[PDB]
Amino acid sequence: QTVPEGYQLQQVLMMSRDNLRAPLAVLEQSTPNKWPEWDVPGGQLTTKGGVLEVYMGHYMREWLAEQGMVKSGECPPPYTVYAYANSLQRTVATAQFFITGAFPGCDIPVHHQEKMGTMDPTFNPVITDDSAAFSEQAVAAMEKELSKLQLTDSYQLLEKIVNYKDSPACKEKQQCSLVDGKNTFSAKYQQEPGVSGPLKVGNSLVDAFTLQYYEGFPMDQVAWGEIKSDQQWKVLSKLKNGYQDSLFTSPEVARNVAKPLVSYIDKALVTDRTAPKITVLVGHDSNIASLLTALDFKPYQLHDQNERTPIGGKIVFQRWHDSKANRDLMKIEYVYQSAEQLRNADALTLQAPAQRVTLELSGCPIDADGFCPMDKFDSVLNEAV
């Protein structure tokens, strides 16, 4: 929040993911209960998700205006803001809501490749190394990452919540447990790192419950009212976070699958002394997770949030101009909404701000004010490519 004297914000790039969506229904076979209905088809952005993106867009507009990047009440000059989303409905819609919330009444288009419904290679977290050595090390890293996690209590709580014993996947079986199930990881070329087993089942169930919570469903219709404490949410979130960490937090997988994004960021921020002053990239949680590991971010902890890359969350890269020393500096923040802010659709203003956490690259150590030298930042980006 503190800006040293003489510092002028010059450039900003935001790495974002799709907002609150309808789950793509594992969900039916894992429970006898009836899942509550959604207003939108599965995989599409919900109206609440668009509203949450609008609020975040307005806050980002207020913050940018406070730092002199754009003038509040006037549309920025043409080509000042560049919005780029993956060619999926939820990513394009997320970008549209954010841009309209940030610059209502301006003519700022959301760029995307023509083939809608297909992944854009820039946002496609697929493996591009076809060598056998890569796949062996990648799978080993995923299993090593999963080995650190203790998910037995999470599986037990999930089985109790969904009544797993009476589910279609359990009939004809005397004992039916996800605790003893085996997880098999995959690291195939031109495909995303995946996993089969109880990890995927638990991730899908807890993700569905998380989306129900943020959507604003009555509490008795969120996991059928079975989640009764914050600790239970924390125990269940281990499954979602463990799924994400195993697949995209291993450094071997992350440096390969996130290569197009790091290349785009290095091109758009470092070797871009030309022009886009505000860049908004709308991808997926996988892109953010792999990017965080690829750039060797230090570990961080979000407040009032049990996810690592939650909806509405954005990684804001900020190039600042130190006027006294005539040098550029880099400051990176995670600007996100708390669980309460998401569920309640709280308005975000400078007085009632979104949550902010200063991030740090292992290669770009931050000072007491969260800034690090721009040359070390470009060095890290060039070493990652």
- Give residues in contact with a second copy (CB under 8 A): 39-41, 44-45, 47-48, 50-51, 54-55, 58, 62, 72-73, 75, 89-90, 92-93, 96-97, 100-101, 104-105, 116, 216, 345, 347, 349-350
**Distance separating alpha carbons of residues 50 and 97, to the nearest angstrom:** 6
For residues 47 and 342, the answer to whether their CB atoms sit within 8 Å is no
Minimum Å distance from CB 116 to a second copy?
8
Which of residues 233 and 264 has its CB atom nearest to Zn ion in the complex?
264
CA 221, CA 229: separation in Å to the nearest integer? 15
Quick one: which segment of 77-85, 291-299, 313-321, 374-382 binds Zn ion (CB under 5 A)? 374-382
Burial class (CB in 10 A: 0-12, 13-18, 19+), 243: buried
Beta bridge partners of 328: 321
Q: Which does 274 bind (CB under 5 to 8 A by kind): a second copy, Zn ion, none?
A: none
Q: Which is nearer to a second copy, 119 or 205 (CB)?
A: 119
Other Cβ atoms closer than 10 A to 238? 21
Looking at beta carbons only, is 92 or 127 nearer to a second copy?
A: 92
- Interaction partner, residue 290 (a second copy, Zn ion, none; CB < 5-8 Å by kind): none
382 binds, among a second copy, Zn ion, none (CB under 5 to 8 A by kind): Zn ion
What's the closest the beta carbon of residue 108 comes to a second copy, in angstroms?
10
Tokens 């802010």 belong to 341
In the numeric block, the tokens 């229904």 are attached to 25
Binding at 270: pick from a second copy, Zn ion, none (beta carbon under 5-8 Å per type): Zn ion
Smallest distance from the beta carbon of 1 to a second copy, in angstroms? 18
Q: What is the DSSP string of 296-319?
A: TBPP---SS---SS-TT-EEEEEE
Do 330 and 372 form a contact (C-beta atoms < 8 A)? yes
383 binds Zn ion (CB under 5 A): no
- Cβ-contact 302, 326 below 8 angstroms: no
Q: Are 55 and 348 in contact (CB under 8 A)?
A: yes
Residue 270 near Zn ion by CB under 5 A: yes
Q: Is 382 in the site for Zn ion (CB under 5 A)?
A: yes
Residue 150's binding partner among Zn ion, a second copy, none (Cβ under 5 to 8 angstroms by kind) is none
Binding site for Zn ion (CB under 5 A): 266, 270, 378, 382
